[PDB]
Design a protein around this ligand. Structure first.
Ligand SMILES: [Zn+2]
Lengths: 67, 25, 213, 136, 101
RNA sequence: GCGCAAGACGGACCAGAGCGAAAGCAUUUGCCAAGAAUGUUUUCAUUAAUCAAGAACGAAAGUCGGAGGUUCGAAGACGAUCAGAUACCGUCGUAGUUCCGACCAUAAACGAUGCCGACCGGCGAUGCGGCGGCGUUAUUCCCAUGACCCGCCGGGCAGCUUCCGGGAAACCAAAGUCUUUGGGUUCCGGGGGGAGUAUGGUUGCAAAGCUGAAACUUAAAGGAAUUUGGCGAAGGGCACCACC
């Protein structure tokens, strides 16, 4: 690896439709706090609302479709 | 057996019959 | 294994004085030891640079080729090697329901430099036009191409390298092409797509020195 | 890496070629000439199984490694030369070009002109495969 | 029976056209029969444009575009779901599919 | 990244556009020869239409003799896949693919629709040639030419629509003017299989091409369309006798 990445935390804003082969995960718009205009879309499973935050180990991947 | 491969098999049989006829003159 | 970039010096590449911006960037080469002289690695090198990085109030869809010839000290004096166009406009000007005219010439300047100019021309659709075809006859295309060849032949035979590459910075050749082909059929996008050289004469130090001011 | 330059007056410009295919990504960095390179890191050097060579994560790791090595050397700005497989095979770039470019953008470098250098031919050479193509 | 008014292609007085190759496959298909798709794309996709403009030295830098032309064999086109089968009454619709964004 | 050498090909422009009897034809320019349509108050006066015998051209593959062989690639050599896999897939690779000279005359050579000629509705368009007209442009005046716009005529590739009409229907402005049955003319089919097979003739270096039966066996083989049907077909929903 030769590098350590700090743990980045970010707040979701809007929940899209549920994706996955078995439909086990949701798709949300994940928005950071280092810049107020930096909002990405990632994949998260479990019950997700609008307002809770997420813990992001790897903060530069976008979302994914059914494949 | 479709028509083209039947034609190819018939051609091979015709070649064998022609060869045995010309060698059995 | 020893670090290979301990023997690398950042040189300076210099545009000729006929351009506005002189400093292009920086390159590097291994030091001299035996069979590898440091000046040889900068002998043949082609720089694909942009036009808006070369000039100030000019467009950004044209590119130029600059070749180094000799180094004096820590400076790489460059020379004209060719003119190209960006691929984005090259596949953005082409559209359906229109035709193309292309001409290529083997013209030589008034000095010992021989060029090869390529040109492309497209179709203008009129403002009050309802027809979507916008095609043309074949003899009109031949006449437009003939106008292109005589314009490109006429305008560079009386001039040298400095004057033709000074004319290459605007589109005056393309403007004269699209103004000559007005009574035949209208053209809306005329540009010089490519410039190539075939004949290279004996190198002269004084001509390159006077090319840099 | 060293010289009489200053880090505040100007910036060092290089040219990076991104070969993206559907099998591997080549995150290459050359000088302004393009003749002599700085470091060449490929997407297969990071992952172990080749199925992850076409993954965007391998291209991000290779781009981050070559970008940290280049900004350790002292090159700050890059000119993009994106290139697909080209020829008669495929005109569409690979899946790792976007991830490699984003990893170069997020590493702290600077980005100049962007252009595509995919070798499109003038209908030259017969393609790989028969008249009926690949059957699957 | 006769499925279409034409023969699934666009030759009326020619008899022969030059062949082209598929993109997903290597199938030799005639030019006027293949389902062309001239897609217009750019370098970055939706959200990397902000990061590119933040890292771009030139202010108000216009982004380039990628122009390729895609030729498909009809089996590889239907398997890629770019064209779908239609009903017998609604087959005779030569209008293009509507674009919105 | 800079150059060299060889062979092949002509992308985007390229369309239900053009030419050609058909097979077919796409880098710029030069030369030779031919042709449709348009224009004509020119020329001859029935020279016309279809066609046994015969004649020209005829994709790719195949054969003989050369030069050349970049890529692709029958046969072959392997690696996986699989119960078997000398198949789909992947890597090499001989003939062949390219050019010349001599052959054969075969295609779903298909618009699966012979050629000539008369009649029989409408509409928007396209390519060519000719005719007429408000306007804009080749910078401001005039005329002719090109470029737009508005219409007409003739030939053609097509398209939309119609309860002309036809058909078993799919459909066709011809596949209409057909029992209210006759415009001229060439070729060609009498249930299916045997069979495009055997012999004979002819042609070809060869492979094969043309001509082409019979005994015997069979009550069906087929064309169009309708309704649940099944799709390892597509588009939307549902179920803890399904899954997460
Ligand atoms: Zn395909």
């Amino acid at each position: 690896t030769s590098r350590v990445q700090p743990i980045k935390l970010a707040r979701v804003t809007k929940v899209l439709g549920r994706t996955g082969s078995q439909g086990q995960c949701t798709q949300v718009r994940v928005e950071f706090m280092d810049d107020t205009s930096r909002s990405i879309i990632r994949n998260v499973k479990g019950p997700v609302r609008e307002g809770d935050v997420l813990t992001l180990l790897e903060s530069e991947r976008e979302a994914r479709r059914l494949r | 057996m479709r028509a083209k491969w039947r034609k190819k098999r018939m051609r091979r049989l015709k070649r064998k019959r022609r060869k045995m006829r010309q060698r059995s003159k | 294994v020893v670090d290979p970039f301990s023997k690398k010096d950042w040189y300076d590449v210099k545009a000729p004085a006929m351009f506005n911006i002189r400093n292009i960037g920086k390159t590097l080469v291994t030091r001299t030891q035996g069979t590898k002289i440091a000046s040889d690695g900068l002998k043949g090198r082609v720089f694909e640079v942009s036009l808006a990085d070369l000039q100030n109030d000019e467009v950004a869809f044209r590119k130029f080729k600059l070749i180094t010839e000799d180094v004096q000290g820590k400076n790489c004096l460059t020379n004209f090697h060719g003119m190209d166009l960006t691929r984005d406009k090259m596949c953005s000007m082409v559209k359906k329901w229109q035709t193309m005219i292309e001409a290529h010439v083997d013209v030589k300047t008034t000095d010992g430099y021989l060029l090869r100019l390529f040109c492309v021309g497209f179709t203008k659709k009129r403002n009050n036009q309802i027809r979507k075809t916008s095609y043309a006859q074949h003899q009109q295309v031949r006449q437009i191409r003939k106008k292109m060849m005589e314009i490109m032949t006429r305008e560079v035979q009386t001039n040298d390298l400095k004057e033709v590459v000074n004319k290459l910075i605007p589109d005056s050749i393309g403007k004269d092409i699209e103004k000559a082909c007005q009574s035949i059929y209208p053209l809306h996008d005329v540009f010089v797509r490519k410039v190539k050289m075939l004949k290279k004469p004996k190198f002269e130090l004084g001509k390159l020195m006077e090319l840099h001011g | 890496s060293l010289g009489p330059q200053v880090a505040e007056g100007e910036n060092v410009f290089g040219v990076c070629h991104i070969f993206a295919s559907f099998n591997d990504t080549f995150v290459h960095v050359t000088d302004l000439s393009g003749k002599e390179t700085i470091c060449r890191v490929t997407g297969g050097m990071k992952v172990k199984a080749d199925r992850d060579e076409s993954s965007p994560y391998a291209a991000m790791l290779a781009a981050q490694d070559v970008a940290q090595r280049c900004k350790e050397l002292g090159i700050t700005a890059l000119h993009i030369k994106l290139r697909a497989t080209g020829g008669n095979r495929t005109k569409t770039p690979g899946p790792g070009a976007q991830s490699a470019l984003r990893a170069l953008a997020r590493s702290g470098m600077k980005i100049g002109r962007i252009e595509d250098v995919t070798p499109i031919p003038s209908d030259s050479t017969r393609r790989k495969g028969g008249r009926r193509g690949r059957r699957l | 029976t006769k499925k279409r008014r034409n023969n699934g292609r666009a030759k009326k007085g020619r008899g022969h056209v030059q062949p082209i190759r598929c993109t997903n496959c290597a199938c030799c298909v005639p030019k006027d029969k293949a389902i062309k798709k001239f897609v217009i794309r750019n370098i970055v996709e939706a959200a990397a444009v902000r990061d590119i403009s933040e890292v771009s030295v030139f202010d108000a830098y216009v982004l380039p575009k990628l122009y390729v032309k895609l030729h498909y064999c009809v089996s590889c086109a239907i398997h890629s779901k770019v064209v779908r089968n239609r009903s017998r009454e609604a087959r005779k619709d030569r209008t293009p599919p509507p674009r919105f964004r």
